[PDB]
Design a protein around this ligand. Structure first.
Ligand SMILES: *[C@@H](C)C1=C(C)C(=O)N/C1=C\c1[nH]c(/C=C2\N=C(C[C@H]3NC(=O)C(C=C)=C3C)C(C)=C2/C=C/C(=O)O)c(CCC(=O)O)c1C
Ligand SMILES: *[C@@H](C)C1=C(C)C(=O)N/C1=C\c1[nH]c(/C=C2\N=C(C[C@H]3NC(=O)C(C=C)=C3C)C(C)=C2/C=C/C(=O)O)c(CCC(=O)O)c1C
Ligand SMILES: *[C@@H](C)[C@H]1/C(=C/C2=NC(=C\c3[nH]c(C[C@H]4NC(=O)C(C=C)=C4C)c(C)c3/C=C/C(=O)O)/C(CCC(=O)O)=C2C)NC(=O)[C@@H]1C
Ligand SMILES: *[C@@H](C)[C@H]1/C(=C/C2=NC(=C\c3[nH]c(C[C@H]4NC(=O)C(C=C)=C4C)c(C)c3/C=C/C(=O)O)/C(CCC(=O)O)=C2C)NC(=O)[C@@H]1C
Ligand SMILES: *[C@H](C)C1=C(C)[C@@H](Cc2[nH]c(/C=C3N=C(/C=C4\NC(=O)[C@H](C)[C@H]4[C@@H](*)C)C(C)=C\3CCC(=O)O)c(/C=C/C(=O)O)c2C)NC1=O
Ligand SMILES: *[C@H](C)C1=C(C)[C@@H](Cc2[nH]c(/C=C3N=C(/C=C4\NC(=O)[C@H](C)[C@H]4[C@@H](*)C)C(C)=C\3CCC(=O)O)c(/C=C/C(=O)O)c2C)NC1=O
Ligand SMILES: *[C@H](C)[C@H]1/C(=C/C2=NC(=C\c3[nH]c(C[C@H]4NC(=O)C(C=C)=C4C)c(C)c3CCC(=O)O)/C(CCC(=O)O)=C2C)NC(=O)[C@@H]1C
Ligand SMILES: *[C@H](C)[C@H]1/C(=C/C2=NC(=C\c3[nH]c(C[C@H]4NC(=O)C(C=C)=C4C)c(C)c3CCC(=O)O)/C(CCC(=O)O)=C2C)NC(=O)[C@@H]1C
Lengths: 70, 164, 78, 171
């Protein structure tokens, strides 16, 4: 059952083949593939999902102007 | 709360475990990289087809309600993206859908409107996965992702059934 | 010269022909007995703001360097 | 053309005032549709332009890039929105007086002293321009507003010219 925490899995996909990051790739802690998979990475983190008042106001303001009409 | 990272050898192995690994991660990428747009468009479309949702008696009235609704849309979208990453719906059903209809019934969150919000997010996701745009408008190699599109569509259908 | 206040005109177009569910009390001027009574242009000077938390969400979307919708040529690189 | 809202409080123009306003700007009905097709897509236009700027120059969010840190990305996303909205008011009013006086004048000097990269700003503005033109002619992928079929190429060219004034000012 859901825990009502408001959290969800945030996935970030890094297909960074050919990238010169200018700094080390230290996030992935496992072993190297010795191939292009060493330039790509997936990040998954359970995080509280939060929506600002500005965003909510923005969606309203861009929705109220397109309501179905006669 | 600590983030997990899957690259190099671990990522090599992962793409041996899930089907169509490379395409599958492109599919996930196309959704999460457009997450805020998918969620806002679905909520906006839910409302434009039913303006009473933002009338004083509607369930999206006030910034507080709108934000909670946009938040829920993102929670659901993200659990669907994790189902696509994983290749099954187990976590989606257990951590998101199970108990959710009962929650919405006690809060009075309208089921007819959630049904439409979910179907629009589904339409977004299918279009990004089964993207028929020209090669010059794609960041990925043009190919057939119809199986992944049907799979993600199925995950949305499980959302719809759970809170329908 | 602009005043660095971050204020900008926010336009909201209400083409609400047929919408009797909302009583048109915001516009206070004269009416026409025509569809123009059912439409309204709203303009307001608003301080445009983006929170750091919201910017972090956009960064999370952009950092794939493949955050593009259906439209537009793919001009990005890695 | 008419700068009609130069006067905190919101202004509301409907009924008789709106009937008159549409006579004071050229192609009143079409113009309001054109403005609406842009403003109703404002969040996507800005996000697409800033993302496209970044995906063409990934180093912008590297530690030495001008969009690095949440504070800077927020300022850039904000500026993109500010510029788009002043352009939308130029299209509503039918001229660029407010666009120049209240947004663009002194803006290049500000970006120069801050080190905001002009070549990257140019691409953001160029992408927003491409979005707006497509929304005016209703050729974007999303077409959520319904209009009577007609030719709005003059209005599309007009809004394109407003974006060109932005590009010339901060280029
Ligand atoms: C190439 C696209 C690029 C240029 C050119 C540039 O100037 N900056 C570039 C990329 C970039 N990467 C990050 C941050 C992260 N990169 C990864 C993937 C990387 N890390 C690993 O351990 C592995 C191993 C296979 C890879 C391929 C990750 C996981 C990053 C951060 C995750 C997080 O939780 O924040 C950035 C952001 C700024 C920085 O360099 O830290 C850029 C700009
Ligand atoms: C019809 C689209 C509709 C249904 C059906 C429904 O349930 N709610 C509907 C519309 C709606 N309108 C507003 C608020 C505003 N509407 C206008 C334009 C309106 N007001 C006028 O004076 C005139 C012309 C003389 C018209 C055409 C404006 C300016 C509104 C408020 C702006 C502001 O700054 O607050 C809403 C929001 C909730 C409410 O009823 O107040 C809805 C949902
Ligand atoms: C449907 C999903 C779309 C599509 C995708 C597609 N991708 C293909 C090949 C491919 N994609 C990646 C990146 C992927 N792999 C990763 O590890 C990660 C990030 C961690 C991502 C993102 C790679 C590396 C590859 C190919 C590698 C290789 O050596 O071949 C293909 C080609 C077929 C295939 O390889 O399976 C397709 C197709 N194409 C579409 O048209 C839609 C929009
Ligand atoms: C380019 C912009 C697109 C286009 C527009 C178009 N609109 C037309 C007629 C029309 N539009 C409105 C809504 C408008 N009027 C308002 O007051 C407001 C909101 C306050 C909005 C929004 C109306 C009411 C009308 C018609 C009024 C009438 O009595 O006839 C037309 C027809 C030509 C014309 O009327 O000038 C066009 C054309 N059509 C397109 O195909 C492109 C994408
Ligand atoms: C109110 C008048 C109203 C709207 C608001 C809009 C809502 C809506 N949107 C769709 C279908 C898709 N929306 C997508 C979103 C994006 N595309 C992009 O390029 C950016 C990154 C995203 C945010 C705008 C996508 C990809 C969709 C799939 C293609 C398509 O257009 O169908 C729908 C469709 C519902 C359905 O198919 O049942 C709606 C209702 N439409 C409105 O009327
Ligand atoms: C980084 C990977 C990257 C991008 C992000 C993208 C930048 C880019 N976008 C365009 C052209 C248009 N973008 C539009 C935005 C939307 N269309 C919709 O339906 C939703 C609601 C809006 C937000 C996503 C529109 C309407 C465009 C015009 C039509 C078209 O297909 O071009 C361009 C084009 C520049 C040019 O024409 O020279 C770019 C570069 N591309 C990336 O690689
Ligand atoms: C948007 C498409 C909907 C809509 C959504 C609203 N939800 C509101 C409160 C709420 N939502 C949840 C479920 C959410 N939390 C989780 O942990 C998970 C999954 C892990 C999910 C999917 C909960 C538990 C709650 C109550 C506590 C809270 O707010 O966090 C809400 C406000 C309710 C109120 O003010 O009475 C809204 C408006 N509303 C709509 O009209 C459409 C259909
Ligand atoms: C995004 C496409 C850009 C980019 C933008 C940044 N701007 C930064 C600070 C800044 N911007 C303005 C102009 C803005 N304020 C106004 O009142 C008006 C018009 C009415 C506009 C157009 C000002 C005055 C300032 C300084 C004060 C402030 O931040 O509010 C900024 C941070 C600079 C820093 O702290 O180092 C950024 C990142 N940056 C990019 O890389 C792209 C090209």
């Amino acid at each position: 059952a859901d825990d009502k925490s408001g959290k969800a899995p945030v996935i970030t996909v890094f297909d960074h083949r050919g990238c010169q990051r200018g700094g080390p790739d230290r996030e992935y802690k496992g072993k190297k593939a010795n191939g292009p998979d060493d330039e790509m990475c997936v990040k998954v983190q359970s995080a509280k999902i939060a929506v600002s008042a500005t965003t909510a106001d923005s969606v309203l303001q861009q929705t109220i102007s397109t309501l179905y009409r006669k | 709360a600590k983030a997990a990272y899957v690259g190099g050898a671990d990522l090599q192995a992962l793409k041996k475990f899930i089907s169509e690994g490379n395409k599958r991660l492109d599919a996930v990428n196309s959704i999460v990289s457009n997450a805020s747009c998918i969620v806002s468009d679905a909520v906006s479309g839910m409302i434009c087809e039913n303006p009473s949702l933002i009338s004083p008696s509607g369930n999206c009235y006030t910034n507080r309600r709108m934000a909670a609704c946009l938040r829920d849309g993102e929670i659901i979208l993200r659990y669907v993206s994790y189902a696509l990453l994983s290749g099954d719906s187990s976590v989606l059903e257990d951590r998101c859908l199970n108990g959710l209809k009962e929650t919405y019934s006690s809060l009075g969150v309208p089921a007819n409107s959630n049904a439409r919000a979910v179907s629009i997010m589904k339409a977004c996701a299918v279009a990004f996965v089964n993207n028929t745009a020209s090669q010059r408008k794609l960041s990925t190699p043009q190919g057939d992702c119809s199986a992944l599109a049907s799979e993600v569509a199925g995950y949305f259908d499980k959302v719809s059934a759970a809170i329908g | 010269a602009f005043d660095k206040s971050a204020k900008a005109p926010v336009i909201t177009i209400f083409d609400h022909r047929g919408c009797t569910a909302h009583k048109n009390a915001e516009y206070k001027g004269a009416l026409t007995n025509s569809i123009d009574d059912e439409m309204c242009v709203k303009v307001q000077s608003v301080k445009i703001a983006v929170s750091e938390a919201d910017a972090a969400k956009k960064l999370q979307e952009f950092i794939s360097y493949e955050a593009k919708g259906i439209d537009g040529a793919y001009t990005g690189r890695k």
